[PDB]
Design a protein that fits this description.
part of a larger assembly; 6 chains; A: 432 residues; alpha/beta; 4-stranded parallel beta sheet; 3-stranded antiparallel beta sheet; 15% strand; B: 125 residues; 4 strands; contractile protein; t6ss; bacterial secretion
Chain lengths: 432, 125, 63, 96, 48, 48
């Protein structure tokens, strides 16, 4: 008799789960959940004992535009007040290190305009704005068709991307960074792998992978920034499997294939080295998945800004070198913290008896604090002292006594970001 | 006052002075990030410049959710029957991340809660 | 805008400026060829100035 | 925080901050002049956080906000660097 | 273009062509260098 | 190719403050980009 009762329970739970799927796979529901779940995922991988802080500001993309369009200028925007005015520009306050926007951007003119404003804000506050790209940005339904794209460079030649192309040429683009595919936040509910109480719920992911709780990669990138700071109080160690751009401990999900077993990739796709490089060339931050593991990595953090080409001469190539350093976030983060230290520490010196050469003397002694100019300092030292050389010149503002014009130029240690190898067999080689 | 107090001048005056030379003391700056996003199910009437930011850390994350007050009013296909015109409207409330578990979802949806109650009754056989 | 944004003037102003000196940036020019010929079995009624050119590459030749 | 004898008085500052006993900043500036002179017999060291234009030990007042706590700012407002500079351009001496 | 007579950030409008896509030019036409020069000779200020 | 580079790059310079010797200076520095005036440059260098 009980056997039939058990069958009733089976069919009951079957029906209940069918309904439960609808709520859990609801786009509104997932928006809410992924927001807060992704937030904690960020929060609990930081260390608040290392002088890390984070604030939440509830804002939709639509009302960001509302505010930016409403205000007469960016200096009177509500966000500017929260970021710049109440922080960086306030005596006794503190400056916002970076802004993480939980958004997906398309090529739509509204999205483009929003990025323009965020670039301006970041430039003024000296803090980068990081967010993510939607699948449709690449003309595809989801990120699972990235392997079918034959050539992104050529794709972006379409009239469709006119505004985006102009955006990449702006001097404010240095403060924008957008990430590519999303990543899993939650393993599907399962009697064994992820059980719930009472109700025998087994979550049924359909053919649509949008049933999976995907999360915004920007948060992963954000934890990279935090770790670097937690260890060194600087943020350049965010672009390598070993350097600190590795994302460890991703969710896994083994399920039946064509009679075999396979795990849902933590990122929508398994990005190849060539595909990753292509995305890098187009200014995207692609989190790549280490095949067969639960680890992913950010191989580089190029900003939105497109590098300028100069004439092939000693001077022209130096110009290229300089400009490219500007286009990459691992170096801009150095500048950003320097800006923040200068703003704070100099306000303390206002009203002191300083002549022109007094500033040169003091500013020199100060910047040396972060310089490691040894023949071969170890990577740990190089991390905590990101600069190799620095130069400071101070001039007078003529016709305005007590005011000065200061120039600060720095040479950071270089990151290893690629190489070409030529292999050759040879006889009569000099013996090593 | 951070000046340091001394007694009125006498023939012999003794004062402790810390030998910091001319070194300029400095203040360590935190790394503060600002997470901006749609954390509620609706837009606020309060202007952006007026709504405030919330400091979050490991020791108060759940408290923050509770205080933020989350709510979802949404309609899903009603699959507890065999009618394409049947729709189910729910009003979910969240205080912590635990409230996004199916267990909580069922408890806040009578159409499922009663079926769970039924399940337990059947199990009690 | 490619000008670069700055904040309103204060006592202490800090701006990042890329040291490109006076070097004039330049744009690489592609090598574009135009293949002109009788690719159809008949002449078109459309005037030469009106008929358009077609961009061809390895990923769309058959298309 | 500021008790009186016998009578259990708790002062109730209303929505109007003019209930607070505001004072004339000129006197603060005057003490700046005095300190500089007391130390050097000259008065130029009056314009900086470290130089001698710093006003230390202001009154504080923590009270309930929107369920949180906040202190009444010792000056009516929290002047920003840009706002301060603007006032300087218009010939005002702003205590920030 | 570099001296300061450059007008940046014009509106764009991609729409269907003859089965392809094209953007409405921000100015009514795409002025050629020769046409621009002609207009200059006749005392007109042509935004190209 | 030289003609093509001149046409493009010079249009960018229109409206700039250039005196006669300014052009000589700049044009000289530009053309040097494609010059290999060594005693004996390798064919690869001579090509580019």
């Amino acid at each position: 008799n009980k056997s039939l009762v058990d069958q009733m329970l089976v069919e009951l739970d079957k029906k209940i789960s069918a309904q439960m799927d609808e709520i859990l796979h609801n786009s509104q529901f997932q928006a809410m959940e992924s927001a807060w779940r992704g937030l904690k995922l960020f929060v609990d991988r930081t260390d608040f004992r290392e002088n890390n802080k984070v604030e939440i500001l509830h804002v939709t993309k639509d009302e960001l535009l509302e505010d930016f369009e409403f205000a007469p200028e960016t200096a009177q925007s509500g966000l500017y007040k929260h970021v710049y005015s109440a922080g960086y520009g306030q005596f006794g306050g503190e400056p916002v290190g970076a802004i993480i926007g939980n958004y997906a951007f398309t090529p739509s003119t509204p999205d483009m305009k929003l990025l323009q404003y965020m670039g301006a804000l970041g430039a003024m506050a000296h803090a980068p704005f990081i967010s993510s790209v939607g699948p449709e940005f690449f003309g595809i339904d989801s990120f699972e068709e990235l392997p079918n794209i034959k050539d992104l460079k050529s794709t972006f030649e379409s009239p469709k991307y006119t505004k985006w192309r102009s955006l990449r040429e702006s001097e404010d683009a240095r403060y924008l960074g957008l990430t590519a595919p999303r990543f899993l936040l939650r393993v599907p509910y399962d009697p064994i792998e992820n059980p719930v109480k009472s109700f025998n719920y087994a979550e049924n992911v359909s053919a649509s992978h949008e049933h999976y709780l995907w999360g915004n990669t920007a948060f992963a990138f954000a934890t990279r920034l935090t770790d670097s700071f937690a260890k060194y109080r600087w943020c350049p160690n965010i672009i390598g499997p070993q350097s600190g751009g590795a994302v460890e401990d991703l969710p896994v999900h083994v399920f039946e294939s064509m009679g075999a077993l396979q795990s849902k990739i933590p990122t929508e796709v398994l990005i190849t080295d060539r595909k990753e490089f292509e995305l890098a060339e187009e200014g995207f931050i692609a989190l790549t998945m280490r095949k067969g593991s639960d680890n992913a990595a950010f191989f580089s953090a190029n900003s939105i800004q497109k590098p300028k080409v100069f004439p092939n001469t000693k001077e022209g190539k130096e110009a290229e070198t300089n400009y490219k350093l500007g286009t990459q976030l691992p170096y801009m983060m150095i500048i950003n913290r320097l800006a923040h230290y200068v703003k704070v520490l100099q306000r303390e010196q206002i009203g002191a008896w300083k002549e022109r050469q007094d500033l040169e003397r003091e500013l020199n002694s100060w910047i040396k604090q972060y310089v490691a100019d040894q023949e071969n300092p170890p990577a740990d030292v190089r991390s905590r002292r990101p600069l190799r050389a620095a130069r400071i010149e101070v001039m007078d503002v003529e016709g305005n006594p007590g005011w000065y014009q200061v120039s600060l130029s720095v040479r950071p240690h270089f990151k290893y970001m690629g190489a070409n190898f030529e292999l050759s067999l040879v006889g009569r080689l000099d013996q090593a | 006052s951070k000046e340091g107090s001394v007694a009125p001048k006498e023939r012999i005056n003794i004062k402790y002075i810390p030998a910091t030379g001319d070194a300029q003391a400095e203040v360590e700056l935190p790394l503060k990030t600002l997470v901006v996003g749609d954390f509620k199910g609706h837009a606020e009437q309060t202007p952006l410049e007026e709504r405030a930011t919330v400091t979050v850390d490991k020791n108060n994350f759940e408290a923050v959710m509770r205080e933020s007050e989350l709510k979802i009013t949404a309609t899903v296909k009603n699959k507890l029957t065999d009618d394409e015109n049947a729709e189910l409207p729910v009003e979910l409330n969240f205080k912590s991340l635990a409230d996004f578990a199916p267990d909580a979802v069922a408890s806040q949806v009578p159409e499922l809660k009663k079926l769970i109650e039924l399940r337990e009754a059947l199990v009690a056989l």
